[PDB]
Design an enzyme around this catalytic site. Structure first.
Site, short mmCIF file in Angstrom:
data_model
loop_
_atom_site.label_atom_id
_atom_site.label_comp_id
_atom_site.label_asym_id
_atom_site.label_seq_id
_atom_site.Cartn_x
_atom_site.Cartn_y
_atom_site.Cartn_z
N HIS A 45 -17.17 42.87 93.51
CA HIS A 45 -17.53 44.06 94.23
C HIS A 45 -16.36 45.02 94.36
O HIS A 45 -16.59 46.17 94.72
CB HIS A 45 -18.04 43.76 95.65
CG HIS A 45 -17.04 43.43 96.75
ND1 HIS A 45 -16.69 42.22 97.19
CD2 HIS A 45 -16.32 44.35 97.46
CE1 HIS A 45 -15.80 42.38 98.12
NE2 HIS A 45 -15.59 43.66 98.27
N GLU A 59 4.64 43.01 94.71
CA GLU A 59 4.48 43.93 95.81
C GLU A 59 4.60 43.29 97.18
O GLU A 59 4.15 42.16 97.41
CB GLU A 59 3.11 44.61 95.61
CG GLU A 59 2.64 45.69 96.58
CD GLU A 59 3.62 46.84 96.69
OE1 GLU A 59 4.65 46.60 97.28
OE2 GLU A 59 3.39 47.94 96.20
N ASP A 93 -19.47 36.65 93.19
CA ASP A 93 -18.58 37.75 93.45
C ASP A 93 -17.22 37.43 92.91
O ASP A 93 -16.27 37.10 93.62
CB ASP A 93 -18.52 38.01 94.96
CG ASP A 93 -17.91 39.35 95.36
OD1 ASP A 93 -17.64 40.19 94.52
OD2 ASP A 93 -17.73 39.56 96.55
N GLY A 186 -10.26 45.42 102.41
CA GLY A 186 -8.97 45.59 101.75
C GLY A 186 -8.37 44.24 101.38
O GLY A 186 -7.42 44.18 100.59
N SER A 188 -10.53 41.73 100.34
CA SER A 188 -11.44 41.28 99.32
C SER A 188 -10.82 41.13 97.97
O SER A 188 -9.96 41.92 97.60
CB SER A 188 -12.56 42.25 99.17
OG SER A 188 -13.40 42.11 100.31
N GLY A 189 -11.16 40.04 97.30
CA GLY A 189 -10.62 39.78 95.99
C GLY A 189 -9.37 38.92 95.97
O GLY A 189 -9.07 38.31 94.95
CA LIG Z 1 6.37 48.54 97.39
#
Ligand SMILES: [Ca+2]
Length: 240
Positions: A45, A59, A93, A186, A188-189
């Site tokens: 999704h 990150e 999903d 945010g 999700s996944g």
């Molecule tokens: Ca950064």
């Protein structure tokens, strides 16, 4: 993640940020797990809109240079053939993304360890959810990667009347439900990391929370059960 704390920079090196192009800028929409140097597992999704997507590995703070990130485009999106946008409660999903380039592995970028096919965790097994999603119901995204301890609720209990009932299937994992800590939009996944025989393995792809809110008592965060999809994952990666 509601009820979370900031993860240390090197704790969850398979976590990625999935971002879409918004004008001249990029915005985080979902998490994902790096499973090969050129393949990312995420929620189907998350890639339902026809957007331009990039993956950011290494990150930590979405809004400042950490000095550890690599940015790579998405060359192919493979969603599960059985995914239905109008029914996330039906399951499937999950989506695989092959990256335009292989990333470099180092102590901020590593591959996620997937469970063996068919593995089910004992009720209340120790797991951690990670992401940059909303820190409150209807709140805003976290700037730094958050983590929260989310113990599993097994299928018999989670598909019982008092929890999710019929909304949940056995192709899903439930974790959380204490009313304090949870996944949120945010997230999700992204991964549900669970400790199994002294090793953390990614057992869940975050899928959904309650329409009532993220952290709702007896409505655990629901996850796609990765061990139900090992043959599909391997079959996609071997053919693409
Ligand atoms: Ca950064």
């Amino acid at each position: 993640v509601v009820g979370g704390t900031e993860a240390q920079r090197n704790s969850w090196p398979s976590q990625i940020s999935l971002q879409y192009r918004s004008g001249s800028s990029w915005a985080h929409t979902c998490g994902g797990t790096l499973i090969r140097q050129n393949w990312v597992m995420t929620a189907a999704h998350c890639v339902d809109r026809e957007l331009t997507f990039r993956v950011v590995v290494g990150e930590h703070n979405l809004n400042q240079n950490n000095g550890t990130e690599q940015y790579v485009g998405v060359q192919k999106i493979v969603v599960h053939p059985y995914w239905n946008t109008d029914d996330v409660a039906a399951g499937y999903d999950i989506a695989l993304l092959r990256l335009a380039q292989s990333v470099t592995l180092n102590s901020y970028v590593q591959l996620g360890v997937l469970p063996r096919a068919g593995t089910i965790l004992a009720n209340n097994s120790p797991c951690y959810i990670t992401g940059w999603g909303l820190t409150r119901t209807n709140g805003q995204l976290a700037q730094t990667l958050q983590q929260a301890y989310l113990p599993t609720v097994d299928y018999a209990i989670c598909s019982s009347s008092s929890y999710w009932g019929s909304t949940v299937k056995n192709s899903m994992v439930c974790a959380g439900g204490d009313g304090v800590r949870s996944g949120c939009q945010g997230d999700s996944g992204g991964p549900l990391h669970c400790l199994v025989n002294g090793q953390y393995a990614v057992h869940g792809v975050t899928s959904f929370v309650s329409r009532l809110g993220c952290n709702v008592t007896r409505k655990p965060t629901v996850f796609t059960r990765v061990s139900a999809y090992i043959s599909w994952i391997n079959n996609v990666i071997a053919s693409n």
